Structures are given as C-alpha cells and as structure tokens.
Amino acid sequence: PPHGELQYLGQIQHILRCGVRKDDRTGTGTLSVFGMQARYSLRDEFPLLTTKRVFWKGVLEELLWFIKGSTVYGFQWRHFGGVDQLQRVIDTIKTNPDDRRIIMCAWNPRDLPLMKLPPCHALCQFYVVNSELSCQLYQRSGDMGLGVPFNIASYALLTYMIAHITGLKPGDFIHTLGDAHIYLNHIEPLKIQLQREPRPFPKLRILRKVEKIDDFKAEDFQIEGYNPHPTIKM
Amino acid sequence: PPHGELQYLGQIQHILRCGVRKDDRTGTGTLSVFGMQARYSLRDEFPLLTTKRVFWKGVLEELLWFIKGSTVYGFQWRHFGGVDQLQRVIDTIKTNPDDRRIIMCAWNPRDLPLMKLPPCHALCQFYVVNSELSCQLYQRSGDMGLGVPFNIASYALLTYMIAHITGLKPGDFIHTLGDAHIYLNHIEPLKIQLQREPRPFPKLRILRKVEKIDDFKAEDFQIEGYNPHPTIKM
Structure with missing residues (x-):
C-alpha cells in the first residue's frame, strides 16, 4: 500500500506540469491549480514528511501557542467573537460523536477590519466512527512548498491531541485545498525534492496521560523513527 | 479522457465496499466515508448525471428561488446576518479576480437557534484564472444517493449563471465532502445504478444575455443532449 507522501509529491508534480500562472495579493507569481485533496492515515504513524526535513519543533511549539489562545489564530480558537471553538469540539466529540457539525474555523486576522463578515480562510471538521477520530482541514489557499508540509504536521498533531483527551485513536487527516499554488522561486527546489524517495513515516508518542x-x-510528545532527506530552504 | 460521472460511481462503489455503519441524527443507518472530492469540467458540457434521470426542472427552479432570496438558504445568500453574499461574490470577481476569499457560506436553519455561532454546513469558494470561473463546494455531509447528484447540478448551474454575468467561461466544479454517506435503503437501488454506463454529458445553453x-x-436556460438512464426512486 502506497506511502501517503506520494500524494503530496504527485500534487507538486501536477501543479508544475499543469498549474496556471496566477499572482498573489502582493503580485508575486505562482503556478496554481484549484481544488486538491489528500488523505494521510494517522494509524500507528504520523505524516511528518520525509522528502525534506520538516521543522517539527516549530510545528509543536506553535500549536501549543495557538492552544494557549495567546496573541490571531489561537485567540479565535478559544475566544471566537467568546466561544471556545476548541473546547466545544472536544465536548461535542464527548457528547455526540455522530455529529456532522464538529467544525472549528479560523480567519486571516488581516481580513477582520477589511469588510463585514469576512469569509474564514480555514476550517477543520472532525469525524468519529469506531472509536477513531478523523480531521479534515479545508484551506482556501495553500502554499504547497512552505506551508502545506508544516500544516499536514500541525493538524495531524492537533488530531492526535484531541484523540488523546477524548480517548479515541487517531484515524485520517484529510487536507483539502482551494487555490493550491507553488511560488515561482520554489519551483527549482521542488523539482529536486521530487527526485527523492519517501521513507516510512515516523510515529508520534504521547508520554503521559493528559486530561x-x-x-x-x-x-x-516524542517523534520516533524520523529519518528525512536533508532540509530544503524555500 | 474519462467520463466525469465515473467519479461519482467510483465513490458510490467505495462507500458500499468500505464505508462504515454510522447513524444520522434521527438514528437512521448509513454507510459512511469521511473526506471525498470529485471535479467536473464545465467546459462545453454540463454535469447532469446520466446513470439516472436527475430532476433538472426542480434544480433550476429551486436555484432561482434561492437567488430570489425568498423564504432559509436564499435569505442567507442575500441577507446574511444583511450582507448580500451572492452580489459580493459577483462584485469581487469583477474587481479582483485573483482574490483567494471569493467565498459564500450557508447554514442549516435548524442550527441557528441551537447554539451561538453555529458552524456553516456548506461553503462555495470561487476561483478565476484565464477568463474561466471555477467553483468548489464543501459540504460537511452529503447524501450520496439523493442529494449529491442534484447538488452537482445546482452548483454547476450557479457557476454557469455567475460566469455568464461576469463575462467568464465556466471552468470546473469541485465537490468536496465531509461525511459522504449512503442511506441503508438506497444501497440496493445504487447497486443497480452502478451497473449502468454513463452517456456523454449534455450541454447547458443560456438563450439571452442577462446582466x-x-x-x-x-x-x-436550455439543456441539450440529455439522454439519461431511467429514474431511480430513492
């Protein structure tokens, strides 16, 4: 059965081959494809990509910062408006695991003063069946070179944390994108990364029972068996 | 190049084979898979499914009702809170087609009195490149037997209408799902539908210039070349 990382690499390859030139809001060039999805199992493994070294310390440390609600993304998760979206997700999983509305949303803070009721930007929908917790992240845009590998790890990590406190096993992380794009300056680095064969994903271990x-x-938290290809600066 | 309808049929086949039993909020049984996506070209054709007759008159008539903002889904599109989400999408496409925030959202009206700031339920994100308009619909759950074929047509139709008034050509419709499920009682009908070979999709023609x-x-509006298999009652 294929390595989950082959989806990301196949997606990078697809944007390079078929993506269209599209500028971002600074007028910086990208190659762009609209609408992508990948699924990474969280069962006995953890989708920390191996075709380049992912900055796991920064993933964990930033997530813990968001969860603290300190300032921004964490403020919205915990003080929405506030509504603690994160605790509500936990409490809903615990009171009605069948629920189709186990959804948490985040806004780009630059959008908030720009217009009335701005659209969100990212949503996470959680799903429970057979004592497994899955998470689907929909982002309206994804920086395939820099942001996407880091976010696969962050939201996979969030799913592990929530599965842990709700007494569920991690299931799948599904990453859905609107504008999936590669910045022009990342094209040569990504082409080299595409030459690299994935290694088996590591495992993530939680060392304590946390409530x-x-x-x-x-x-x-402890990542075990992480043996990636070298760092690619983007 | 494969018929777009093969995605839907492959998805039905996947849920029957691999879906897990999961009850809905009435305690009615389904087979469920979390996280699905399909892409239907809107270029010189229209994704009105052919392995069963889709109720096109009801698709068009209900969409026109929603657009009227009459009462519910249309009220939210046009009087959000209001904010006219639909006109804002049109105006944004016209003033900044590169924008990554061309998003409109809808809520299940039963959720509104149930809690503070309920999650949405469905979002549509629009995307423009090379004078083509694409639309991605994310629904937190999709009834694969009844709702999904009807919604592929509605949102494909909406994309045609918006492409028309903004002077763009229709691109792709991307349908992303959270809980994609088949109701237990639709399983036998769907198995029979899976035996049917898709025919070429029809075209949709707009007969007038509308501003x-x-x-x-x-x-x-006029559907041309629609030659589906017989109606399946679900």
Whole structure:
C-alpha cells in the first residue's frame, strides 16, 4: 500500500506540469491549480514528511501557542467573537460523536477590519466512527512548498491531541485545498525534492496521560523513527 | 479522457465496499466515508448525471428561488446576518479576480437557534484564472444517493449563471465532502445504478444575455443532449 507522501509529491508534480500562472495579493507569481485533496492515515504513524526535513519543533511549539489562545489564530480558537471553538469540539466529540457539525474555523486576522463578515480562510471538521477520530482541514489557499508540509504536521498533531483527551485513536487527516499554488522561486527546489524517495513515516508518542487540552507541554510528545532527506530552504 | 460521472460511481462503489455503519441524527443507518472530492469540467458540457434521470426542472427552479432570496438558504445568500453574499461574490470577481476569499457560506436553519455561532454546513469558494470561473463546494455531509447528484447540478448551474454575468467561461466544479454517506435503503437501488454506463454529458445553453443575477428566468436556460438512464426512486 502506497506511502501517503506520494500524494503530496504527485500534487507538486501536477501543479508544475499543469498549474496556471496566477499572482498573489502582493503580485508575486505562482503556478496554481484549484481544488486538491489528500488523505494521510494517522494509524500507528504520523505524516511528518520525509522528502525534506520538516521543522517539527516549530510545528509543536506553535500549536501549543495557538492552544494557549495567546496573541490571531489561537485567540479565535478559544475566544471566537467568546466561544471556545476548541473546547466545544472536544465536548461535542464527548457528547455526540455522530455529529456532522464538529467544525472549528479560523480567519486571516488581516481580513477582520477589511469588510463585514469576512469569509474564514480555514476550517477543520472532525469525524468519529469506531472509536477513531478523523480531521479534515479545508484551506482556501495553500502554499504547497512552505506551508502545506508544516500544516499536514500541525493538524495531524492537533488530531492526535484531541484523540488523546477524548480517548479515541487517531484515524485520517484529510487536507483539502482551494487555490493550491507553488511560488515561482520554489519551483527549482521542488523539482529536486521530487527526485527523492519517501521513507516510512515516523510515529508520534504521547508520554503521559493528559486530561485537558491546555495541559499538554512540548515534553509530552516524542517523534520516533524520523529519518528525512536533508532540509530544503524555500 | 474519462467520463466525469465515473467519479461519482467510483465513490458510490467505495462507500458500499468500505464505508462504515454510522447513524444520522434521527438514528437512521448509513454507510459512511469521511473526506471525498470529485471535479467536473464545465467546459462545453454540463454535469447532469446520466446513470439516472436527475430532476433538472426542480434544480433550476429551486436555484432561482434561492437567488430570489425568498423564504432559509436564499435569505442567507442575500441577507446574511444583511450582507448580500451572492452580489459580493459577483462584485469581487469583477474587481479582483485573483482574490483567494471569493467565498459564500450557508447554514442549516435548524442550527441557528441551537447554539451561538453555529458552524456553516456548506461553503462555495470561487476561483478565476484565464477568463474561466471555477467553483468548489464543501459540504460537511452529503447524501450520496439523493442529494449529491442534484447538488452537482445546482452548483454547476450557479457557476454557469455567475460566469455568464461576469463575462467568464465556466471552468470546473469541485465537490468536496465531509461525511459522504449512503442511506441503508438506497444501497440496493445504487447497486443497480452502478451497473449502468454513463452517456456523454449534455450541454447547458443560456438563450439571452442577462446582466444581473436576479434577472434570470427558467426560460433563459436550455439543456441539450440529455439522454439519461431511467429514474431511480430513492
């Protein structure tokens, strides 16, 4: 059965071959495809990409910062408007795991003063069946070179944390994109990364029994068997 | 190049083979898979499914009703809170086609009194490149037997209408799902539908030049070459 990372690499390859030139809001060039999806199993493994070294310390540390609600993304997750979207997701999983509305949303803070009721930007929908927690992240745009590998890890990590406190096993992480794009300057680096064969994904271990989302600390987590290709600067 | 309808049929086949039993909020049984996506070209054809007759008159007539903002889904599109989400999408396409925030959202009206800031339920994100308009619909759940074939047509139709008034050509419709499910009682009908070979999709023609979204009427639209298999009652 194929390595999950082959989806990301096939997606990079598709945008290079078929993506269209499209500028971003600074007028910086990208190659763009609209509408992408990939699924990474979280069962006995953790989708920290291996065709380049992903900055796991920054993934974990930033997620713990967001969860703290400190300032921005974490403020919205915990003080929406506030509504604690994150605790509500946890409480809903616990009171009605069948629920089709287990959804948390985030806004780009630059959008907030720009117009009335701006669209969100990213949503996470959680799903429970057979004691497994899955998560689907929809982002309205994804920087395939820099942001996407880091976000696969962050939201996979979030799903592990929530599965842990709700007593569920991690299931799948599904990453859905609107404008999936590669910045022009990342094209040569990505072409080299596409030459690299994925290695088996590592595992993530939680070293302690933790009861509340806010009680996790960086030392509670341990990545085992992470043996990536070298760092690619983008 | 494969018939777009093969995605839907492959998805039905996947849920029957691999879907898990999961109840809905009435306690009615389904087979469920979390996270699905399909892409239907809108270029010189229209994705009105052919392995069963889709109720096109009801698709068009209901969409025109939603667009009227009459009461519910249309009220939210046009009087959000209001904010006219639909006109804002049109105006944004016209003033900044590169924008990554061309998003309109809809809520299940039963959710509105149930809690503070309920999650949406469905979002449509629009995308423009090379004078083509694409649309991605994300629904938190999709009834694969009844709702999905009807919604592929409705949102494909909406994309045609918006492409028409903004002077763009229709591109792709991308349908993304959270809980994609088949109701237990639709399983035998769907198995029979899976035996049927798709025919070439019809075309949709707009018979008049229309300038404002509100000026369309049912007679402005004409489906040509629709030659589906017989009706399946679900």
